[model samples]
Target: DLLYKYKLYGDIDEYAYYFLDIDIGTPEQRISLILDTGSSSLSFPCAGCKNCGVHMENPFNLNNSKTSSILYCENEECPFKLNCVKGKCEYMQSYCEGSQISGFYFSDVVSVVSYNNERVTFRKLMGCHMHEESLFLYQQATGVLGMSLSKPQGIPTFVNLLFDNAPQLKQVFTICISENGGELIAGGYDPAYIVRAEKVVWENVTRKYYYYIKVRGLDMFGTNMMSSSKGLEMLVDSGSTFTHIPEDLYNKLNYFFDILCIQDMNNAYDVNKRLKMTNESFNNPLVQFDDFRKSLKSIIAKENMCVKIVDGVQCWKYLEGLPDLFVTLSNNYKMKWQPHSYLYKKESFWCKGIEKQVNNKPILGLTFFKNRQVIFDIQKNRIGFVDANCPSHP
Candidate 1:
């Protein structure tokens, strides 16, 4: 509530999901919630939840919160028409992955711990999920605090209540993500976090329901590796870790990195077997070479040879100056990812950061937002991005 601005420090888990510790009810039970912008339902696993994981935080024991009250169907804000169960207002929400969240709506003193350890509280309504399944059964977060711009129907969203209380918030939110924990800003951004305010680029939101924009494709230096038949509509999914790409695009990117590693130092990897010119790869593929290495000793490398001392330090030498993956966007814009951005560490080996989801439509995930300040100015139907250092935990 400082200056009508709300800022909370969100922790990045496994360098994947961004989550926050939110306190609810009187005396405040602190719970961990994934800040998922992909979905619109703010749901917490309640005490009676079945199939829910015993996560880092326990299920929201509603009986403990004296300030919390079930939202009966009599409430004017109820979204249900006539599905009221014996006069009790209930909600059964589902995700694309088939995870079901069902329970009644309840009100409480929702709040978060400020960076300075101060409590920032507000009265809000949230779904007290009595049952959890699929993703929720094995997830770490006790709840999913949605930040998407989708319709909450008549039920007020976590953001709407904040906006209702702090009318000066202006319906804007900023995500300042770094390699570590970072800040989620509402109302406006902190100028100090911007690399340069002038460099902020605002793109019109092509659609709402969720933040959608026209995304063209990915490319390398003169290697038009991936392109869409027409402009692709991409969801800016802050909740997601890996950016969902097409299988063909994933193949293209994997082959590129494989080619890079092989060309630098195969580490005795079987190049022919790895980079097979399957129908999956480029055709005719007339390519140029800047500098050719002293030809190979053998084409059929059955196993790795340089399995001795690591490349001075874990695989950095094998991956120097790898070309950037330019995600060409609509309207002559490009978001660049250097080697460090895509080359993720495995337990022992390393892999590129691209994948084909079970149900994919190309999403701009947290992977694409690291070191970038993304502004969701829903009021103006625009998304903005600027280079930022992304203030980390103090």
Candidate 2:
């Protein structure tokens, strides 16, 4: 019953969003960019953009660049949101939700290289230099390159162009996140991202997007939280990097597991022990007051400059005020409990020695799709597949 189990974090291959570098006026300011398939439109914050000092410099003139040119889209988000002051396409002023967002726009060529590494024909796209307001928080970072088909999402998306040309390009992509490890892959199909994937029962979820069988539930131990919550309906998104759960549900899980509270180092003077949950503290039945005070003095003397207390745990410097704790509880127990032996075999293709040693990190990503035979049915809004270990495909 498992579907796509994607990676939490890792360096993934550049499968779809090919890096396209752009240059501005004199001295040739350049930057790396993403070619998106989900939303269409090109944008990068200009110089003077708030907190944009870390990104490549924008000289406000495309006249010097060899590939620079003006191109306009008949899209709403582009014209309505982009404004020009004076004669130049410089000095931007726009509004969203009644708040002013200052930034200018420009015309540029967006050329995505082919799979064989050939730069394709350049298409005119818009690039925005947002105002240096607190609204958009970035430090020396460029703008977004959208590839969505829907309006208000962005313009000049991949679908608008793909539909104008390759209408018959029927392909699917998926991600697999497993307890032990995972993978991610895009372009054509990666046969490895499937679990219990038998055949693709396709459906037209949308004209440009496909859907396949939907995953019903996700369990943590015996709890069926993925289904009980309305937001947990499974989805296929190669764009997102992490799996998010409901805020309340996450806290409940942490509390149930008796997760150790990061101690408050500032309050150590009024406390009992230097280490909050030391094995010695847990096993001790009775505390002799003099012995306890002596232990506390010895521990406090280790840091003479600090205020003295009996014995109390100190706070972790890295996680002072942060309440969120991200931990990937090992899924070894669940793997042993899985009823589907075929999934275990399919998982082996992704799980490896390094993954097990590193608490199975860097396991869930797009490569899982390449390793499994996944089918996305756009018509019905579902993804269907059989275990990659099925004798047929492996």
Candidate 3:
């Protein structure tokens, strides 16, 4: 079923976060901003500030947007009631990557085009920033659409303000990401978009922060390992590219990989030919190797530099009869990570799927969520996942 469909623009691998199309202001200045659940406040480039930088769309032009009414720190209707610079209500936010943003509050119309290609808009109060630093300074989008937990002490999140203004729209938002692109359904979850025969598996999130889930076990091919053995928690973050594996788990993974590879390493070196299982390794083969070496960014990439056995014995081969990968969650929900999804050909060789988790952190990024429809049931505080073709047929 088609519910207010919004086409999300961005590459899952090449880019950071997907963008949502929307317009703000009286004349309705069209802007595409990063769609992030990792944060709670909304911000856009504002006037009279330096380093707003270049974006896909122009920054919030207050002078041109006649409908924009800047809020004062002492104003009764202002959501952000702190930090009065004279009379202006200013907001500041900083990120883990050292990005910073400071701006003031305002009100305007936020408009979006529905699947039926109709302009649907609403009036809302929000904030805008003129000063930015580091990553946010040169971010791909003009603004940030924060979908995290609402802020009662400061400015409310975009989702809260959105639902508050438009009672006609559903409270839940659904994301279905195919490799190419995906859909961001702001209206609600339409089960018809789900393509997985297996029912949508949901995990409860009672907290007020990230969409975190407890880890029980992990399955690589057919091998099963416990997270308790490694002591790891999981975070389902769309902002990251690689699925990072922490220590103990990653150490175990390398041990298993070396066993399969050692068997091939001897045979491959003796015969002066790489281990060839079949066509699984066109040139790429099953990772029958020692420790997973670190790459520039992907800690799992198979660099051209091979082991110093025999120059001729340096190549990848396929090994048939191996099951795919799965990360078992609480209640034994197996989140499937297909071979193609994890292993991709970077440059001329096949690269491993996961990167090393700094400080041994297991993060579920694009690799796990790709080809899946992720539903964030905000009202219920539950997150769901199901196999999908992504942006499914209406």
Residue 334, candidate 3: how far off, in angstroms? 2.2
Best by TM-score: 1
Clashes of 1: 0
Query: Pairing residues by index, what is the TM-score of model 3?
Result: 0.76
lDDT of 2 by residue, 1-394 (tens): 2122212222222121122344433345555444233334456665444544344445344555555554343432335354445433443433221223334455554443333343323344465555445423442334444434434543444334533443334333333333223332223334443444445333223234312112233333344333242222222333322223444443443332222222333466534344343434432222233333343344334332221122221122221121211222122122111212111222112111101102211222122232234444322344444345312210
Ten residues in a row with the worst lDDT in model 1?
Answer: 291-300
- List the global CA lDDT of all models: 0.65, 0.34, 0.62
- All candidates in order of lDDT, best leading: 1, 3, 2
| Error in Å for residue 360 of model 1 | 4.5
* Candidate 1: tens digits of C-alpha lDDT, residues 165-216: 6664467888877656667877666667776564777788887557888878
Assess every candidate by TM-score. 0.79, 0.45, 0.76
* TM-score attained by model 2: 0.45
Name the regions of candidate 3 deviating beyond 4 angstroms: 75-81, 118-120, 152-154, 224-232, 254-323, 343-353, 358-362, 392-394
Cα error of candidate 3 at position 235, Å: 3.1
